[PDB]
């Protein structure tokens, strides 16, 4: 009989388990025997307090480095305002030690945990690449609770070295199975930011994780977009509980918050899942997340059923992670087929946007060719366009099965006249659909202003396979 942790703050970890069903179903995974043993997670952040009484027992120097100061020791820099507490808080969510009379427990409280000190300084492309590419045959899972500015006017993503690190990680990392990159989808909710304007979350190589409050609502800081894959609990209003974790100076906190707290919980659940089947590829893991995540009782006004019967929201992706269901489905999972890529250049001539532009195109999805896709995974609309005020644009993409993805919602603060330069807007919402047939791109001016511009390129990029479907939900 599984005995749940006795740690003093475990009863306050409302998101891990409970009779109420408002949790991530993590105790059910623990009871199946999965606690993270043998899995290695690295927190890419401002450092990790490696001697913290709730981290020391799980700490892994092989999962750690200090990129800011070019040394192996990721110890945080101590300051009066405890500025560098952030990475230690994230690490405790993943792998805080259980049953040791200290604070609470990690989701994967027997996993090995490290940290890359890379935020305490100028975060260049090279700094990101050296962190994302750290010891990729030892680290299984990378957790990143940082990214481009959430001011609601930035469009930015990995530069060349960082993108090269993503492709090297998913291709050769973890023995060729692929590094698992977990990303926090963003804190830009108050600025009406879109997490599709963030190339890290929008990447197909990352599992972008959004947040839900204790009462099942969309937090004030949440960013909606089509690239988000799933959700974990985090903070909300001041009547809702928050996240319990290790804090700087060997302390315990019950007030960890924001998008930053969601990705580490996902990384922990993925660690449990990898223990249940160490042969899962980076794409396997995203399939498991899609199939097992739970919409129920998450409140949103945009829940839609896609072409294969799955509910999906721009606030939540496929819903809340379910650790028990993840580890159960992992055990007998059949590795997916190799990833195919079908490139469809849509336009025959540039198109003026004006007040509204609709581009319709019927595709065969590389019928007759070795990259024929009948089972979609990610889809991208790679758009090049000019426009006088970028944030007045709203962009939607409709799949042949009728699933409408919001690629871009209005961003009131985005006054940019720089448009989009082959920006690869990504949607997870048509996962497992057949992409053959009519795709529709809609670009509209959401303001009364007389805006102007031109769409000069629209590449539809389909990823997926031609085998192995399930009966739709």
């Amino acid at each position: 009989v599984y005995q749940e942790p006795t740690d003093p703050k475990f009863p306050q970890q409302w998101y891990l388990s409970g009779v109420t069903q408002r949790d991530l179903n993590v105790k059910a995974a623990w009871a199946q025997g999965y606690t993270g043993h043998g899995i290695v997670v690295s927190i890419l952040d401002d450092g990790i307090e490696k001697n913290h009484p709730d981290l020391a027992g799980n700490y892994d120097p092989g999962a750690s480095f200090d990129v800011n100061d070019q040394d192996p020791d990721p110890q945080p820099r101590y300051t009066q305002m405890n500025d560098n507490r952030h990475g230690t808080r994230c690490a405790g969510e993943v792998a805080a030690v259980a049953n040791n009379g200290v604070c609470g427990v990690g989701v994967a409280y027997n996993a090995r945990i490290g940290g890359v000190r890379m935020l305490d300084g100028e975060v260049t492309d090279a700094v990101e690449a050296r962190s994302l590419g750290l010891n990729p045959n030892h680290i299984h899972i990378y957790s990143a609770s940082w990214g481009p500015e959430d001011d609601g006017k930035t469009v930015d993503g990995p530069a060349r070295l960082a993108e090269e690190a993503f492709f090297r990680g998913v291709s050769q990392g973890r023995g060729g199975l692929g590094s698992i990159f977990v990303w926090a989808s963003g804190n830009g909710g108050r600025e009406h930011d879109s997490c599709n304007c963030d190339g890290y979350t929008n990447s197909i190589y990352t599992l972008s994780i959004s947040s839900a409050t204790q009462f099942g609502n969309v937090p004030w800081y949440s960013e909606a977009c089509s690239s988000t894959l799933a959700t974990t609990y985090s903070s909300g209003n001041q009547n809702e509980k928050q996240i319990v974790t290790t804090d700087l100076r060997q302390k315990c906190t019950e007030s960890h918050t924001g998008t930053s707290a969601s990705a580490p919980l996902a990384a922990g659940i993925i660690a449990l899942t990898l223990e249940a089947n160490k042969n899962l590829t980076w794409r396997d893991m995203q399939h498991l997340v899609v199939q097992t995540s739970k919409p129920a009782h998450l409140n949103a006004n945009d829940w839609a059923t896609n072409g294969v019967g799955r509910k999906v929201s721009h606030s939540y992706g496929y819903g809340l992670l379910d650790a028990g269901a993840m580890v159960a489905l992992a055990q007998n999972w059949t590795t997916v087929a190799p990833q195919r890529k079908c490139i469809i250049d849509i336009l025959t001539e540039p198109k003026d946007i004006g007040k509204r532009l609709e581009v319709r195109k019927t595709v065969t999805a590389c019928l007759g060719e070795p990259n024929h896709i009948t089972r979609l995974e990610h889809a991208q609309a790679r758009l090049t366009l000019s426009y006088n005020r970028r944030g007045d644009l709203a962009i939607h993409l409709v799949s042949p099965m009728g699933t409408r993805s919001t690629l871009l919602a209005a961003r009131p603060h985005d006054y940019s006249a720089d448009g989009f330069n082959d920006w690869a807007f990504m949607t997870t919402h048509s996962w497992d659909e057949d992409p053959s047939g009519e795709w529709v791109l809609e670009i509209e001016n959401t303001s009364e202003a007389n805006n102007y511009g031109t769409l000069t390129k629209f590449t539809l990029v389909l990823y997926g396979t031609a085998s192995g479907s399930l009966v739709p939900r």
Binding site: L119, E122, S145, W146, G147, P148, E149, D150, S260
Partner: peptide, 5 residues
């Protein structure tokens, strides 16, 4: 900043 917590 180029990147933020």
């Amino acid at each position: 900043k180029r990147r933020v917590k």
